[PDB]
Amino acid sequence: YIKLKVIGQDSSEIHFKVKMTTHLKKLKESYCQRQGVPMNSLRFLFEGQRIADNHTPKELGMEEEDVIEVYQEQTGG
Amino acid sequence: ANIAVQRIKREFKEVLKSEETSKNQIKVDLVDENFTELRGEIAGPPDTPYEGGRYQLEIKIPETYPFNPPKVRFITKIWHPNISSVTGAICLDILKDQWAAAMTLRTVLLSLQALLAAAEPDDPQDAVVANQYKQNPEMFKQTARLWAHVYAGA
């Protein structure tokens, strides 16, 4: 497991415990749930590239205290 | 509100994905980049004088949405006791004192489609048309049918 900070444009920093070999699906949906918006309404970046539902921290080389940047989608989903 | 723009976008796509759209009963087009104005289209419901017709609806989202309703008007002229024959202004509760903040674009479009199939002549928007509906149903139908051909592609 690994702490990961999710940062929005307001500059809010919300902390998550995440398993190393588990789909980032969960993180992304849990964040959207926390914020009361539909998933597919937000996109999530790590090192300027979008996470995907199939991606895990196993791959991507994701570390402790690493940051993920979240943005609103044009469509808004 | 960006809450209001994100919302409208979501409800726009909800109509896009709807069964009623895939059946071509309702549709919505985007007018402004900002989602403050839409254009709706409803089919003339079957077994009414509008049948065969398509009716465009100007939809404008005021700044106090969703606490006030969308401002809806017929662009397509139509002969109906609850719609102005001159302006397309609409008499319909959900656009007035029965608006509810959780109502969606889809809900509105379906209500208007049901409006076409179900008049309330004792609460008219067009008292001439409503008086005719009540006093001379047959002239009302022939006229509604000719307006539907002339103005609504029937």
Side-chain angles (χ1 to χ4, degrees), chain A residues 6 10 27-44 70-73 76-77, chain B residues 2-4 6-7 10 13:
Chain A
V6 190
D10 45 30
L27 178 313
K28 285 160 70 169
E29 61 199 1
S30 167
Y31 187 91
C32 289
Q33 274 182 355
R34 204 192 132 116
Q35 302 300 98
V37 299
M39 204 165 111
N40 299 153
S41 77
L42 304 188
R43 61 181 178 285
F44 294 78
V70 54
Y71 300 97
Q72 258 183 198
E73 284 283 3
Chain B
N2 199 45
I3 294 183
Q6 290 299 90
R7 184 155 165 197
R10 137 171 22 102
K13 300 178 271 188

mmCIF file of all heavy atoms in Angstrom, chain A residues 6 10 27-44 70-73 76-77, chain B residues 2-4 6-7 10 13:
data_model
loop_
_atom_site.group_PDB
_atom_site.id
_atom_site.type_symbol
_atom_site.label_atom_id
_atom_site.label_comp_id
_atom_site.label_asym_id
_atom_site.label_seq_id
_atom_site.Cartn_x
_atom_site.Cartn_y
_atom_site.Cartn_z
ATOM 1 N N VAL A 6 -4.282 13.462 -4.207
ATOM 2 C CA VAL A 6 -5.015 13.953 -5.392
ATOM 3 C C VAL A 6 -5.291 15.457 -5.267
ATOM 4 O O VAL A 6 -5.956 15.885 -4.315
ATOM 5 C CB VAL A 6 -6.355 13.158 -5.676
ATOM 6 C CG1 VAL A 6 -6.960 13.544 -7.060
ATOM 7 C CG2 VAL A 6 -6.121 11.636 -5.636
ATOM 8 N N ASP A 10 -8.393 23.967 -7.582
ATOM 9 C CA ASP A 10 -8.506 24.766 -6.342
ATOM 10 C C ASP A 10 -7.262 24.618 -5.454
ATOM 11 O O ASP A 10 -6.949 25.503 -4.666
ATOM 12 C CB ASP A 10 -9.781 24.420 -5.546
ATOM 13 C CG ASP A 10 -10.025 22.925 -5.433
ATOM 14 O OD1 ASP A 10 -9.033 22.157 -5.436
ATOM 15 O OD2 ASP A 10 -11.178 22.429 -5.343
ATOM 16 N N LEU A 27 -9.548 4.228 -6.936
ATOM 17 C CA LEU A 27 -9.112 5.575 -6.551
ATOM 18 C C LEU A 27 -9.975 6.604 -7.262
ATOM 19 O O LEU A 27 -10.578 7.476 -6.624
ATOM 20 C CB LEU A 27 -7.632 5.759 -6.932
ATOM 21 C CG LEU A 27 -6.816 7.048 -6.728
ATOM 22 C CD1 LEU A 27 -7.538 8.310 -7.188
ATOM 23 C CD2 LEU A 27 -6.393 7.169 -5.298
ATOM 24 N N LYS A 28 -10.025 6.492 -8.588
ATOM 25 C CA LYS A 28 -10.743 7.449 -9.433
ATOM 26 C C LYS A 28 -12.236 7.552 -9.067
ATOM 27 O O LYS A 28 -12.813 8.666 -9.050
ATOM 28 C CB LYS A 28 -10.553 7.093 -10.920
ATOM 29 C CG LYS A 28 -9.145 7.446 -11.473
ATOM 30 C CD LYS A 28 -8.772 6.683 -12.757
ATOM 31 C CE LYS A 28 -9.573 7.122 -13.978
ATOM 32 N NZ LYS A 28 -9.031 6.574 -15.242
ATOM 33 N N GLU A 29 -12.853 6.408 -8.757
ATOM 34 C CA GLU A 29 -14.288 6.398 -8.449
ATOM 35 C C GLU A 29 -14.554 6.904 -7.045
ATOM 36 O O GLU A 29 -15.487 7.682 -6.846
ATOM 37 C CB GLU A 29 -14.980 5.048 -8.733
ATOM 38 C CG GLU A 29 -14.495 3.824 -7.983
ATOM 39 C CD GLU A 29 -14.906 2.492 -8.666
ATOM 40 O OE1 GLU A 29 -15.559 2.521 -9.748
ATOM 41 O OE2 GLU A 29 -14.578 1.398 -8.120
ATOM 42 N N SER A 30 -13.723 6.474 -6.103
ATOM 43 C CA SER A 30 -13.736 7.001 -4.748
ATOM 44 C C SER A 30 -13.545 8.529 -4.671
ATOM 45 O O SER A 30 -14.250 9.189 -3.915
ATOM 46 C CB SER A 30 -12.685 6.315 -3.928
ATOM 47 O OG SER A 30 -12.513 7.017 -2.732
ATOM 48 N N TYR A 31 -12.633 9.085 -5.460
ATOM 49 C CA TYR A 31 -12.484 10.528 -5.551
ATOM 50 C C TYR A 31 -13.752 11.208 -6.093
ATOM 51 O O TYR A 31 -14.234 12.157 -5.520
ATOM 52 C CB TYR A 31 -11.277 10.909 -6.449
ATOM 53 C CG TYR A 31 -10.983 12.397 -6.430
ATOM 54 C CD1 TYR A 31 -10.098 12.931 -5.520
ATOM 55 C CD2 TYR A 31 -11.627 13.269 -7.307
ATOM 56 C CE1 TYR A 31 -9.837 14.309 -5.486
ATOM 57 C CE2 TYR A 31 -11.394 14.631 -7.284
ATOM 58 C CZ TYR A 31 -10.495 15.146 -6.377
ATOM 59 O OH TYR A 31 -10.262 16.495 -6.343
ATOM 60 N N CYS A 32 -14.240 10.761 -7.248
ATOM 61 C CA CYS A 32 -15.465 11.310 -7.816
ATOM 62 C C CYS A 32 -16.653 11.177 -6.853
ATOM 63 O O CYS A 32 -17.531 12.053 -6.800
ATOM 64 C CB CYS A 32 -15.807 10.591 -9.125
ATOM 65 S SG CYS A 32 -14.647 11.062 -10.417
ATOM 66 N N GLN A 33 -16.665 10.088 -6.098
ATOM 67 C CA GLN A 33 -17.696 9.887 -5.104
ATOM 68 C C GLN A 33 -17.584 10.890 -3.944
ATOM 69 O O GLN A 33 -18.588 11.471 -3.525
ATOM 70 C CB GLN A 33 -17.674 8.445 -4.614
ATOM 71 C CG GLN A 33 -18.483 7.572 -5.507
ATOM 72 C CD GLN A 33 -18.552 6.117 -5.058
ATOM 73 O OE1 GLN A 33 -17.897 5.722 -4.085
ATOM 74 N NE2 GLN A 33 -19.339 5.314 -5.781
ATOM 75 N N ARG A 34 -16.362 11.098 -3.470
ATOM 76 C CA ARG A 34 -16.102 12.050 -2.443
ATOM 77 C C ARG A 34 -16.583 13.432 -2.813
ATOM 78 O O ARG A 34 -17.180 14.120 -1.981
ATOM 79 C CB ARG A 34 -14.623 12.100 -2.120
ATOM 80 C CG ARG A 34 -14.359 12.618 -0.714
ATOM 81 C CD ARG A 34 -12.926 12.968 -0.433
ATOM 82 N NE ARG A 34 -12.867 14.295 0.189
ATOM 83 C CZ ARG A 34 -12.437 14.562 1.411
ATOM 84 N NH1 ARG A 34 -11.994 13.613 2.215
ATOM 85 N NH2 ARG A 34 -12.449 15.808 1.845
ATOM 86 N N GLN A 35 -16.362 13.792 -4.075
ATOM 87 C CA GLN A 35 -16.662 15.111 -4.600
ATOM 88 C C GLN A 35 -18.049 15.209 -5.221
ATOM 89 O O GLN A 35 -18.440 16.267 -5.718
ATOM 90 C CB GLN A 35 -15.559 15.529 -5.615
ATOM 91 C CG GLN A 35 -14.131 15.532 -5.004
ATOM 92 C CD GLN A 35 -14.010 16.505 -3.840
ATOM 93 O OE1 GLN A 35 -14.104 16.117 -2.645
ATOM 94 N NE2 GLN A 35 -13.826 17.780 -4.168
ATOM 95 N N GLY A 36 -18.822 14.129 -5.163
ATOM 96 C CA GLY A 36 -20.202 14.167 -5.653
ATOM 97 C C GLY A 36 -20.430 14.393 -7.153
ATOM 98 O O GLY A 36 -21.504 14.802 -7.547
ATOM 99 N N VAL A 37 -19.428 14.114 -7.987
ATOM 100 C CA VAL A 37 -19.546 14.276 -9.454
ATOM 101 C C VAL A 37 -19.474 12.906 -10.158
ATOM 102 O O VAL A 37 -18.859 11.982 -9.634
ATOM 103 C CB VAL A 37 -18.427 15.157 -9.997
ATOM 104 C CG1 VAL A 37 -18.510 16.552 -9.381
ATOM 105 C CG2 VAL A 37 -17.053 14.559 -9.738
ATOM 106 N N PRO A 38 -20.032 12.780 -11.369
ATOM 107 C CA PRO A 38 -20.086 11.463 -12.053
ATOM 108 C C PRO A 38 -18.686 11.049 -12.453
ATOM 109 O O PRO A 38 -17.871 11.924 -12.689
ATOM 110 C CB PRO A 38 -20.906 11.750 -13.296
ATOM 111 C CG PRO A 38 -21.503 13.114 -13.072
ATOM 112 C CD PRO A 38 -20.570 13.861 -12.217
ATOM 113 N N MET A 39 -18.361 9.761 -12.486
ATOM 114 C CA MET A 39 -17.065 9.414 -13.071
ATOM 115 C C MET A 39 -17.220 9.465 -14.586
ATOM 116 O O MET A 39 -18.321 9.282 -15.119
ATOM 117 C CB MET A 39 -16.492 8.065 -12.635
ATOM 118 C CG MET A 39 -14.937 8.037 -12.788
ATOM 119 S SD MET A 39 -14.175 6.663 -11.898
ATOM 120 C CE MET A 39 -13.595 5.618 -13.272
ATOM 121 N N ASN A 40 -16.103 9.729 -15.246
ATOM 122 C CA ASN A 40 -16.077 10.210 -16.610
ATOM 123 C C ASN A 40 -16.240 11.732 -16.668
ATOM 124 O O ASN A 40 -16.095 12.296 -17.759
ATOM 125 C CB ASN A 40 -17.157 9.578 -17.510
ATOM 126 C CG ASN A 40 -17.031 8.078 -17.643
ATOM 127 O OD1 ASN A 40 -18.035 7.396 -17.876
ATOM 128 N ND2 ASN A 40 -15.807 7.550 -17.518
ATOM 129 N N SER A 41 -16.549 12.393 -15.547
ATOM 130 C CA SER A 41 -16.624 13.858 -15.532
ATOM 131 C C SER A 41 -15.258 14.458 -15.240
ATOM 132 O O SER A 41 -15.010 15.612 -15.594
ATOM 133 C CB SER A 41 -17.646 14.394 -14.518
ATOM 134 O OG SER A 41 -17.151 14.339 -13.181
ATOM 135 N N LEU A 42 -14.392 13.674 -14.592
ATOM 136 C CA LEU A 42 -13.034 14.087 -14.284
ATOM 137 C C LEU A 42 -12.030 13.147 -14.913
ATOM 138 O O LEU A 42 -12.280 11.941 -15.033
ATOM 139 C CB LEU A 42 -12.771 14.047 -12.785
ATOM 140 C CG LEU A 42 -13.646 14.824 -11.799
ATOM 141 C CD1 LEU A 42 -13.010 14.732 -10.404
ATOM 142 C CD2 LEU A 42 -13.838 16.302 -12.206
ATOM 143 N N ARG A 43 -10.884 13.716 -15.294
ATOM 144 C CA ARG A 43 -9.701 12.941 -15.661
ATOM 145 C C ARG A 43 -8.557 13.157 -14.665
ATOM 146 O O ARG A 43 -8.416 14.221 -14.053
ATOM 147 C CB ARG A 43 -9.229 13.232 -17.085
ATOM 148 C CG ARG A 43 -8.818 14.640 -17.381
ATOM 149 C CD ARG A 43 -8.385 14.809 -18.834
ATOM 150 N NE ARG A 43 -8.012 16.185 -19.174
ATOM 151 C CZ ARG A 43 -8.873 17.200 -19.370
ATOM 152 N NH1 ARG A 43 -10.189 17.036 -19.271
ATOM 153 N NH2 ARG A 43 -8.402 18.404 -19.686
ATOM 154 N N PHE A 44 -7.741 12.121 -14.544
ATOM 155 C CA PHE A 44 -6.697 12.052 -13.569
ATOM 156 C C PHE A 44 -5.365 11.877 -14.286
ATOM 157 O O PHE A 44 -5.252 11.026 -15.170
ATOM 158 C CB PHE A 44 -6.998 10.870 -12.695
ATOM 159 C CG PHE A 44 -8.253 11.031 -11.886
ATOM 160 C CD1 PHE A 44 -9.509 10.852 -12.479
ATOM 161 C CD2 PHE A 44 -8.187 11.369 -10.529
ATOM 162 C CE1 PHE A 44 -10.658 10.987 -11.732
ATOM 163 C CE2 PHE A 44 -9.333 11.499 -9.770
ATOM 164 C CZ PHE A 44 -10.572 11.320 -10.369
ATOM 165 N N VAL A 70 -5.964 16.146 -10.977
ATOM 166 C CA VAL A 70 -7.285 15.838 -11.496
ATOM 167 C C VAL A 70 -7.829 17.064 -12.200
ATOM 168 O O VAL A 70 -7.664 18.175 -11.715
ATOM 169 C CB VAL A 70 -8.257 15.277 -10.393
ATOM 170 C CG1 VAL A 70 -8.342 16.213 -9.170
ATOM 171 C CG2 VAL A 70 -9.630 14.989 -10.967
ATOM 172 N N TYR A 71 -8.427 16.849 -13.373
ATOM 173 C CA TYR A 71 -9.049 17.924 -14.144
ATOM 174 C C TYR A 71 -10.449 17.540 -14.571
ATOM 175 O O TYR A 71 -10.735 16.362 -14.763
ATOM 176 C CB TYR A 71 -8.254 18.224 -15.409
ATOM 177 C CG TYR A 71 -6.840 18.643 -15.169
ATOM 178 C CD1 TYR A 71 -5.798 17.720 -15.260
ATOM 179 C CD2 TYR A 71 -6.530 19.977 -14.863
ATOM 180 C CE1 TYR A 71 -4.487 18.113 -15.050
ATOM 181 C CE2 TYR A 71 -5.204 20.388 -14.649
ATOM 182 C CZ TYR A 71 -4.191 19.449 -14.748
ATOM 183 O OH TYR A 71 -2.881 19.822 -14.535
ATOM 184 N N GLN A 72 -11.297 18.557 -14.734
ATOM 185 C CA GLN A 72 -12.635 18.408 -15.309
ATOM 186 C C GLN A 72 -12.518 18.121 -16.803
ATOM 187 O O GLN A 72 -11.653 18.632 -17.487
ATOM 188 C CB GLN A 72 -13.448 19.702 -15.197
ATOM 189 C CG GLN A 72 -14.532 19.837 -14.100
ATOM 190 C CD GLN A 72 -15.249 21.218 -14.253
ATOM 191 O OE1 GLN A 72 -15.917 21.706 -13.335
ATOM 192 N NE2 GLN A 72 -15.055 21.855 -15.427
ATOM 193 N N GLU A 73 -13.465 17.335 -17.284
ATOM 194 C CA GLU A 73 -13.607 17.017 -18.680
ATOM 195 C C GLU A 73 -14.531 18.022 -19.366
ATOM 196 O O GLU A 73 -15.572 18.435 -18.824
ATOM 197 C CB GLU A 73 -14.199 15.613 -18.811
ATOM 198 C CG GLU A 73 -13.206 14.497 -18.534
ATOM 199 C CD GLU A 73 -12.255 14.270 -19.684
ATOM 200 O OE1 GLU A 73 -12.313 15.015 -20.690
ATOM 201 O OE2 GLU A 73 -11.444 13.339 -19.584
ATOM 202 N N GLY A 76 -17.762 16.893 -19.728
ATOM 203 C CA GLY A 76 -18.294 16.769 -18.380
ATOM 204 C C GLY A 76 -18.832 15.363 -18.149
ATOM 205 O O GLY A 76 -19.574 15.139 -17.176
ATOM 206 N N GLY A 77 -18.469 14.413 -19.029
ATOM 207 C CA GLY A 77 -19.104 13.085 -19.057
ATOM 208 C C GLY A 77 -20.600 13.145 -19.355
ATOM 209 O O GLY A 77 -21.356 12.196 -19.127
ATOM 210 N N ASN B 2 -20.561 27.135 -12.881
ATOM 211 C CA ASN B 2 -19.991 25.963 -13.535
ATOM 212 C C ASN B 2 -20.746 24.712 -13.096
ATOM 213 O O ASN B 2 -20.808 23.752 -13.846
ATOM 214 C CB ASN B 2 -18.484 25.792 -13.283
ATOM 215 C CG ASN B 2 -17.836 24.861 -14.323
ATOM 216 O OD1 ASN B 2 -18.090 24.985 -15.542
ATOM 217 N ND2 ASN B 2 -17.031 23.911 -13.848
ATOM 218 N N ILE B 3 -21.345 24.734 -11.908
ATOM 219 C CA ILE B 3 -22.212 23.613 -11.503
ATOM 220 C C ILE B 3 -23.368 23.518 -12.487
ATOM 221 O O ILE B 3 -23.727 22.433 -12.915
ATOM 222 C CB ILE B 3 -22.709 23.719 -10.016
ATOM 223 C CG1 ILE B 3 -21.532 23.580 -9.072
ATOM 224 C CG2 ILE B 3 -23.713 22.626 -9.702
ATOM 225 C CD1 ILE B 3 -21.896 23.589 -7.545
ATOM 226 N N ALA B 4 -23.896 24.660 -12.902
ATOM 227 C CA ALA B 4 -24.995 24.678 -13.833
ATOM 228 C C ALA B 4 -24.565 24.226 -15.272
ATOM 229 O O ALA B 4 -25.349 23.547 -15.981
ATOM 230 C CB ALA B 4 -25.656 26.039 -13.840
ATOM 231 N N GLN B 6 -21.723 22.216 -16.154
ATOM 232 C CA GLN B 6 -21.516 20.764 -16.008
ATOM 233 C C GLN B 6 -22.849 19.985 -15.972
ATOM 234 O O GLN B 6 -23.046 19.054 -16.742
ATOM 235 C CB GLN B 6 -20.677 20.445 -14.800
ATOM 236 C CG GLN B 6 -19.215 20.846 -14.924
ATOM 237 C CD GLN B 6 -18.452 20.162 -16.078
ATOM 238 O OE1 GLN B 6 -18.428 20.676 -17.182
ATOM 239 N NE2 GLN B 6 -17.756 19.042 -15.775
ATOM 240 N N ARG B 7 -23.799 20.459 -15.184
ATOM 241 C CA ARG B 7 -25.114 19.843 -15.188
ATOM 242 C C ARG B 7 -25.799 19.789 -16.524
ATOM 243 O O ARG B 7 -26.372 18.752 -16.905
ATOM 244 C CB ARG B 7 -26.039 20.544 -14.214
ATOM 245 C CG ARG B 7 -27.379 19.873 -14.129
ATOM 246 C CD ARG B 7 -28.138 20.093 -12.839
ATOM 247 N NE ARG B 7 -29.518 19.678 -13.070
ATOM 248 C CZ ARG B 7 -30.558 19.998 -12.321
ATOM 249 N NH1 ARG B 7 -30.404 20.692 -11.201
ATOM 250 N NH2 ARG B 7 -31.754 19.597 -12.697
ATOM 251 N N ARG B 10 -24.234 17.230 -18.803
ATOM 252 C CA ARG B 10 -24.666 15.890 -18.420
ATOM 253 C C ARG B 10 -26.072 15.532 -18.873
ATOM 254 O O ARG B 10 -26.335 14.406 -19.317
ATOM 255 C CB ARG B 10 -24.525 15.705 -16.914
ATOM 256 C CG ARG B 10 -25.730 14.991 -16.223
ATOM 257 C CD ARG B 10 -25.515 14.598 -14.704
ATOM 258 N NE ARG B 10 -24.464 15.422 -14.139
ATOM 259 C CZ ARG B 10 -24.650 16.484 -13.340
ATOM 260 N NH1 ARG B 10 -25.894 16.839 -12.912
ATOM 261 N NH2 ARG B 10 -23.554 17.158 -12.936
ATOM 262 N N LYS B 13 -26.268 15.039 -22.747
ATOM 263 C CA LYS B 13 -25.867 13.650 -23.076
ATOM 264 C C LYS B 13 -26.854 12.593 -22.663
ATOM 265 O O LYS B 13 -26.994 11.591 -23.332
ATOM 266 C CB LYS B 13 -24.561 13.287 -22.439
ATOM 267 C CG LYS B 13 -23.463 14.118 -22.845
ATOM 268 C CD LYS B 13 -22.222 13.702 -22.128
ATOM 269 C CE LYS B 13 -22.067 14.444 -20.810
ATOM 270 N NZ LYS B 13 -20.689 14.115 -20.249
#
